Structures are given as structure tokens and as C-alpha cells.
């Protein structure tokens with residue numbers, strides 16, 4: 469079932485790594501020239517081979533084939549040639565593969581792990597570069613480890629790449645069902661159309677394709693009595709895996725409860741963009757200064773969700789319901805957001821300029837370079853002398869500096885340390 473792609477510029481030796489691992493052609497899949505993976509090789513997957521019968525010239529071939537790969541394949545082996553380092557022609561191929569939520573693994577062809585010394589590869593922004601010998605097959609196993617690892621994260625339910633999926637999560641009786649039907653009744657929304665894909669509500673808002681994942685979970689309770697939360701809770705954690713934005717909805721009336729932290733924590737530690745919703749705010753009786761007293765109340769108990777918005781709204785009175793889709797669309801953008809490597813590093817340079825780096829006992833930390841590695845959430849790698857020397861307090865001081873530069877509200881962000 470999993471389908472691996474093999475993208476790059478022309479003459480990087482795609483076909484030499486393709487014919488190494490591509491087994492036998494299979495002309496009963498959702499089909500192209502499809503090849504089952506090597507029978508000798510112990511992972512099982514499908515090679516996709518690009519052959520789309522627009523414009524013909526130099527630049528407008530990579531457009532065509534990378535697009536096809538981006539659409540059908542589940543993991544994408546972006547492949548470069550190491551015989552002269554990176555090219556601006558490759559940087560352009562990287563720019564085409566930036567427009568995709570699916571994971572992309574860099575392959576540096578014809579080098580050692582040694583000759584893979586150039587920061588230019590990391591700058592492309594698909595994480596660790598993996599060196600290969602297309603002649604000898606060296607370094608191909610560790611590569612396919614990085615490919616196969618992403619098979620346990622491949623969705624069972626898929627949509628068009630332009631579609632954005634999300635979920636509403638919360639305890640028993642907080643208005644998730646009411647909230648959604650208000651958002652459907654909403655002015656700007658249009659709907660769509662048995663069982664297999666009759667579980668998620670597919671609407672459009674501002675001519676943008678949108679999926680609410682597991683409306684079936686809303687619709688279950690209504691035909692079924694409450695045996696336990698433990699089933700709804702885990703059915704929500706299943707939806708978060710499929711989703712990209714988690715709309716973590718509280719009840720304004722009772723306030724925050726132990727169990728709220730459980731379902732939200734998972735979304736943070738899943739890495740998804742979080743947008744908190746305080747429903748039933750009509751039923752909250754207000755004074756001069758209570759709504760901000762409710763926020764500062766939220767930020768103690770949810771101190772792992774700082775980056776998230778907090779809204780207040782109501783499904784009954786229809787107050788601030790219009791705010792919901794806006795906040796989502798924002799979280800999606802920030803969650804998907806990819807940054808430019810020159811700009812990033814200047815922010816990192818600026819970061820040290822203000823606050824001196826950590827001292828240990830003479831040997832001070834130095835930051836050499838910094839690159840974004842993947843999106844959703846946006847993940848960064850700071851290159852230093854000593855990864856152990858960069859402490860978390862400094863590590864997130866860089867987050868806040870990076871958040872200042874490119875916004876980031878809605879998304880969490882990953883910072884890593886590598887060396888050498």
C-alpha cells in the first residue's frame with residue numbers, strides 16, 4: 469500500500485537508484501508505471517514512476533513530474549547529485565516540493581557520510597541529507613529506514629492536497645455538536661453531496677475545501693448511551709492523527725477540568741496546531757473584568773498551550789461563531805509555514821547579539837548555522853559545537869525570537885540541536 473516517490477532534477481541518477489530498489493511492474497492498485505518494492509529488500513512499498521502526458525522546456529518538466537509525485541505518493545525521495553554540491557536548479561526543485569504536507573527525504577547521490585560536508589544540503593529544508601553510492605549501493609539502507617519510518621504515519625483516509633482537515637475535541641457535554649451545526653448553518657459555508665467516507669463532514673468556506681474529522685463521534689452520541697469517555701477520548705486522539713488543526717473546545721460554564729488537559733496535551737505532543745475555544749460564553753454571566761480573568765485562568769492550567777489562540781463564543785446565541793473559521797485558517801497557515809534559510813539565520817544571529825550564549829566552564833556554545841527541516845509543525849535545527857551545552861531555557865528563547873520574526877500563532881514549533 470505505501471507508495472514512495474523518487475523526485476529530483478534530471479541527470480541526478482534517479483533511474484540508477486530506481487532500478488536498484490524497484491522490483492516487478494504490476495500493470496489492482498489505485499494506478500502509472502507502478503513497481504512493487506525490491507523483493508530482496510525487507511520493507512514493502514510501491515515505486516511511483518512519473519510519466520505525465522502543458523509546457524515542455526527545461527524548467528517545466530520538473531513542475532509536471534514533481535506535481536504527480538506530490539499527488540499520488542506517500543513518501544518522496546528528493547534526490548540530488550553530490551558531484552558539485554547543490555545547484556540553484558536543485559533549489560528550484562526544492563521550492564516545488566515545499567508545497568506538500570507529505571514527508572520528503574533528501575538523497576545525496578555519489579558521496580560518503582566525509583564528503584557530505586556541505587551545509588547547502590540541509591539548507592534545502594528536507595532534514596538530514598542521506599549519502600548514497602548508486603554504483604555500490606552504500607548508504608541506501610539508512611535512507612530507506614528514514615522512508616519506512618514514515619509509513620506508520622500514513623493516513624488511511626486521504627483527501628486532495630489543497631483540503632485542510634480539523635477536529636473538535638472536549639469532554640461530555642461541552643457543545644462540540646452544537647458548535648459544528650452552528651458553523652454549518654453559518655453564512656459563508658457550503659456543504660457537499662455511504663459509510664467509508666460518511667464519517668467526516670466536508671464543507672467549503674470562502675471557496676476553500678475543509679474537513680471536520682469525526683463528525684461521526686458527534687453523531688454517535690445521539691444513537692448510543694455513554695459507556696465511557698475512554699472510547700470518545702481515544703476516538704479523538706485518532707482524529708488528531710488525521711487532522712492538522714485541533715480546535716480544543718472548553719465549557720465556559722463549569723470552566724477547566726483535569727480531563728481537558730489529557731486530550732489537549734496529546735495534540736501538543738502530536739505536534740498539531742492548537743486553537744482553544746471557550747464555548748457557552750452566553751451562559752457565563754459577565755462583569756467588567758471576567759473574560760481576561762478567564763484567560764489568565766486558562767494559561768496556568770494550559771501552560772503547554774501558549775502559542776494557541778483563545779476564543780470565546782456560543783453555539784446557542786451565535787456570538788463570536790464567525791471567529792472560529794478565521795482562527796483555523798490562521799493556524800493552518802502558520803502550521804504549514806516554511807521559512808527562508810538566510811532570513812532564519814539572521815534571526816538566530818540577532819538572537820545571540822542580544823543575550824550572550826551559555827558558558828559551561830570556559831567552553832562557550834557557538835551557533836554555526838540553522839535550517840528548517842520540515843513543516844507541520846515547523847521544525848528547526850540549530851547547528852552548534854555541543855548539543856548537550858544548549859539548554860532548554862536558551863533553546864526556547866530562540867523559539868520566542870523565531871516566533872517574533874514569522875508570527876506563529878496556532879502552531880507549536882520544533883527546535884533541534886545537531887553538530888558538525
Ligand SMILES: Nc1nc2c(ncn2[C@@H]2O[C@H](COP(=O)(O)OP(=O)(O)NP(=O)(O)O)[C@@H](O)[C@H]2O)c(=O)[nH]1
Nearest residue numbers: 639640641642643644645646689748751782783784
Ligand atoms: N447556553 C449554551 N448551551 C450550549 C451551547 N452550546 C451547546 N450547549 C448545550 O450543551 C449541550 C451538550 O453539548 P452538545 O451540543 O451535545 O455537544 P457535545 O459536547 O458534542 N455532546 P457530546 O459530549 O456527547 O459529544 C447541548 O444540549 C446544548 O444545548 C452554548 O453556546 N450556550
Ligand SMILES: [K+]
Nearest residue numbers: 585586587888
Ligand atoms: K560545513
